[PDB]
Subunit: 315 residues, 4 copies
């Protein structure tokens, strides 16, 4: 059939929500692939029944076979560790799973290259800005055909928190977080708008203060940790962000979405992936948009890239 | 505000998917209530960010306080045990959590009666046909304002499996499973249609055989066990079924949906809840539809009710 | 791009609503083609702005050039007369526009054959069961790639009227009207269900009477005339019905929808198009479903086909 | 029932599309009211059938009786002249229908005050910034409960035209047009963004030039005339814009939408309605946002208000 085939490489928490949302949106047939025996078949079976409630007709199947990547139109990679086995929830960060998640990207890359070299790839495995580049290199796909999750998720938090303070529709807040996903994420105060209006106007009117915004910025950076400390794990919003990206590709929406993409001189950087607004449509990354950062913003961008490089070296 | 307030009493697996779907559908503000400290706040935080991706404006908050039921328009109860601590996955059934889940329904009932006596209640805790009646009795709500999950979920499986064999849109298969949710569920072959056409026509044409249907019937009854044996748990389709019910109420859709409701003479039964098609709209259960069962079908219905009564006695 | 290209051959009342709905549903790029100069460009411009309100990205362009059919994935033909210039609204029927609408189908057929022989075609021009066959013959497309509007529209009326009486969700009423679209349409009482339940059960319960149903049947047959006599014209529901058909094709939904299709022995008929349930998916008409009519129902079906043949002869 | 009751006062071109969209979105029951006998009943009948195709349950009825405004939750006023009977399509403007459309607003105002004084009112009749104030005065409704269409429609055009040039999703372009709807509309270049980024960045990169933007500005102002000169009439996008506003109210979305609202000192203006961003939620106009215009922008705003006052005097 002409329905898209969407292979979820990793059928864990994010994978499950993604499968649910794909059926809700009737986006395409879904394969829940994992190394864990049986589990993806079980999740697939459960999820498949929702076609009735959703008025959809998407197949949902499980797989324990890498070759099921054959024919994939979109591949979403969440496979990997989510935390270092030994580290507390308080100290959740990035040094030693690097080589293990690198091996996972290498393995998946080989299977993509053999089975679905023309697929559009979204990488989620952390640290994403490192893992996406590794997968790019080992899968051999074109630069316009692979991106990493980051900015859509990170800005959803910033947008949401501001919308709550200002009592406006969440989507009406727009904002940019660039460079990398992680603690070095660059929050661009200058690029925040509310209903298309510069946030500064709302600050001038005392509707939201600079101090409030500083607290919202810190909350945004630390949201994953906040959720973990509350005895939960972030997987629902990550899934929705990924599906927004995938849907833009599948439907040729040409949305402007901030994702990790190969930089070729933007911001003074080459040979590395970093977060920046891109346009996602039928041709994949159709445009890479370079924000005209000032020197102070660029300094923060540089710090983010430096951290990606540091971890890439250890991987 | 006039947005509906939807309180999820139980913030586990089903609760999480329900919160996700409510935001996707912009159905109302959500409270994830649970006895587990912090966890519902974490899930709520994660889920709240999806308002951006979904173009919605639903608050999602966590709660560890029963009094947050105040003002509820809809209350969905998934609180309870999901399996007997000690029993293998192979032997997943119903005798001894009864008194513990009864205590949970009693407790929740008291809080509903005090805080939101005019709410519409959907009960999910198993065995649902027993627990719904217990909650009805202790909450004091009118009979048209409380239902149990069952038939929407069980028929989604039957509909889906037949649709796959016949290669038609899942929603185009209609089917009735009545009496109770559980191993005594009554699958009504006579009441199956495909695009509104009697299934028997498709059997006559050899498009699906009676033997195939028998296997699909057994698969439907055993689906929960099938999913558990695959190292997964059924929670996505249960959530979608519940949201279909809740949405029909909230939007006054007047959908015909099979749910557990107080029987007042239908099928020869009174003073018990059992699964039957009902019409759900703004006034709750607006109609209870009694299928004109033959004697053989009625005998099976009686077996289902007898099992509900047996467990009610032990609760 | 991979977005579908949908060419509306005829940019009148139905064409306008179809363009509106396609953008609402983000189904594909739209060409509003017509012989009237400028008008389609104006409607296209107006409609294109709705992409903003709809969160969609579908191009909407006008055309006065037949060659713009090139590349079409779906072609919807509403081109033609809607009433005989000279006949009152009271006497709205079918004898003398036949040769003129035949010429229009022939002309469009030639352009389809040259420019988009692989497109999926939906014919709407009346009398549709005649015009669809004429277009099939002159376009040269395969039988699984061309259908006529009829049953989805006619049953929407029957379903709706019954749903109002019974106070249930309109989609929960299912019904079959076959043979032809027009005054000889065959309404199959035996094949009506409500929430999947035989309508007869509701009659037995005195919820709706046989006399009420007879009146609803006559109302259904005469609905177009009822609307015309109220100083309006039926175009909104026809458009929605057509878009339901087109969407099933585009999204590979495999819905069971009653449409005019080439009969190859079904109901005892060959070499003619008539209304029957079909399954619409990615391969076009994937299945032609033959209802197992009794002799009385078949007699009415024969009357419908005879009328199609009578008018085909005059065309 | 608790479904909203939406009364369309005026059942012409815009009214018809609004009814269609309300059913598509299942927003509430609809009354198509008009002074033309029978016509609204015909349009209502046609539109009602779409509930089946749309999976909705909204009543659609026609009315020739002002008292059917009773119980209205939302009233949308499109009643009036659309062009001066005698003036060519080339010379489409605003001097002498003023007293006639004023009489229509006065009449409707009296009926609103008597029958639905708590309804939320959207005025569309041109010149809208004048007519909305007239209706406000004669209906007696609070200032937070009545708005005029303008900016959502006018900016949809600007947003769309820019999105086409830049090859991005239309909704990703944000823009502000304020003061009044009509030839004095104030297009604010400084307040245009693309994916939340200042448009100036795209100009700097030569992706769109200042000269291109000037042409798009003129096209935006003249779009209604462009459509009329193409032998069409703008009614589809106006309807969608109105429904976006109505939906924000009904669903408590709190969208920021530019509408005509009573100014109470903003921009230096009082005692007049003018276009400005507002937040629409359950409480109606929840916030009036005042853009921090520079002196040059304010001068243009003043010109717009002066024109509204000039016509108000003649009404
Ligand atoms: C970039 C970003 O914004 C975020 C990234 N993540 C990363 O996303 C990944 C997945 O998170 P999830 O919560 O889904 O973790 P999980 O443990 O539930 O699922 C991971 C699955 O991967 C499987 N897996 C391991 N190796 C695999 C392989 N070779 N192939 C397929 N699946 C594999 C494994 O069995 C598990 O089910 C982790 O690396 C997270 O750090 C998470 C949240 C946000
Ligand atoms: C009727 C039907 O078709 C189905 C019913 N169920 C029942 O639904 C219930 C919930 O299933 P879920 O998978 O969500 O289980 P879970 O363990 O993840 O969540 C249950 C939550 O209830 C909480 N809980 C316990 N007591 C509570 C109380 N007094 N108040 C609120 N929450 C409570 C508990 O902490 C956990 O998070 C179980 O009884 C299932 O048997 C499940 C699938 C289908
Ligand atoms: C099968 C069915 O359920 C229905 C069928 N119809 C038929 O659908 C047709 C279109 O109805 P609509 O209300 O859209 O009529 P319209 O007059 O507004 O539009 C017809 C357009 O066709 C154009 N047209 C004429 N010749 C054409 C050609 N060769 N190519 C393209 N357009 C052409 C013509 O200029 C007008 O704009 C008529 O034949 C109706 O009888 C209508 C309602 C229901
Ligand atoms: C503010 C704005 O962006 C726009 C405003 N308009 C205005 O919207 C109005 C309606 O436009 P439409 O295209 O719908 O015009 P129409 O002639 O098809 O419908 C007007 C209907 O009003 C009826 N009408 C007249 N007096 C009435 C009354 N007292 N009560 C109810 N209906 C009445 C009349 O019979 C016709 O059906 C006109 O004033 C337009 O100028 C239009 C497009 C954009």
């Amino acid at each position: 059939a002409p329905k898209a085939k969407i292979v979820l490489v990793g059928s864990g928490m994010i994978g499950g929500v993604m499968a649910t949302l794909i059926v809700q949106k009737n986006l395409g047939d879904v394969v829940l692939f994992d190394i864990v025996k049986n589990m993806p078949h079980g999740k697939a079976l459960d999820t498949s029944h929702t076609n009735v409630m959703a008025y959809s007709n998407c197949k949902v199947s499980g797989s324990n076979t890498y070759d099921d990547l054959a024919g994939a139109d979109v591949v979403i990679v969440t496979a990997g560790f989510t935390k270092a086995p030994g580290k507390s929830d308080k100290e959740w960060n990035r040094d030693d799973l690097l080589p293990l998640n690198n091996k996972i990207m290498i393995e998946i890359g080989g299977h993509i290259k053999k089975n679905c070299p023309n697929a559009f790839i979204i990488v989620v495995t952390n640290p994403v800005d490192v893992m996406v580049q590794l997968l790019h290199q080992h899968s051999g796909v074109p630069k316009n055909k692979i991106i990493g999750l980051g900015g859509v998720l990170d800005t959803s938090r910033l947008k949401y928190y501001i919308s709550q303070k200002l009592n406006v529709c969440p989507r009406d807040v727009n904002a940019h977080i660039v460079g990398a996903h992680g603690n070095k994420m660059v929050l661009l105060k200058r690029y925040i708008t509310v209903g298309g209006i510069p946030l500064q106007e709302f600050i001038n009117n005392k509707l939201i203060s600079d101090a409030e915004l500083e607290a919202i910025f810190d909350r945004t950076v630390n949201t994953a940790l906040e959720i973990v400390n509350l005895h939960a794990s972030p997987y629902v919003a990550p899934a929705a962000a990924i599906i927004e990206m995938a849907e833009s590709y599948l439907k040729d929406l040409k949305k402007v979405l901030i994702c990790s993409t190969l930089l070729e001189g933007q911001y003074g950087h080459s040979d590395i992936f970093g977060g920046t607004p891109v346009v996602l449509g039928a041709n994949g990354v159709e445009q890479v948009i370079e924000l005209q950062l000032n020197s102070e913003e660029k300094a923060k961008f540089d710090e983010a890239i430096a951290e990606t490089k540091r971890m890439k070296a250890l991987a």
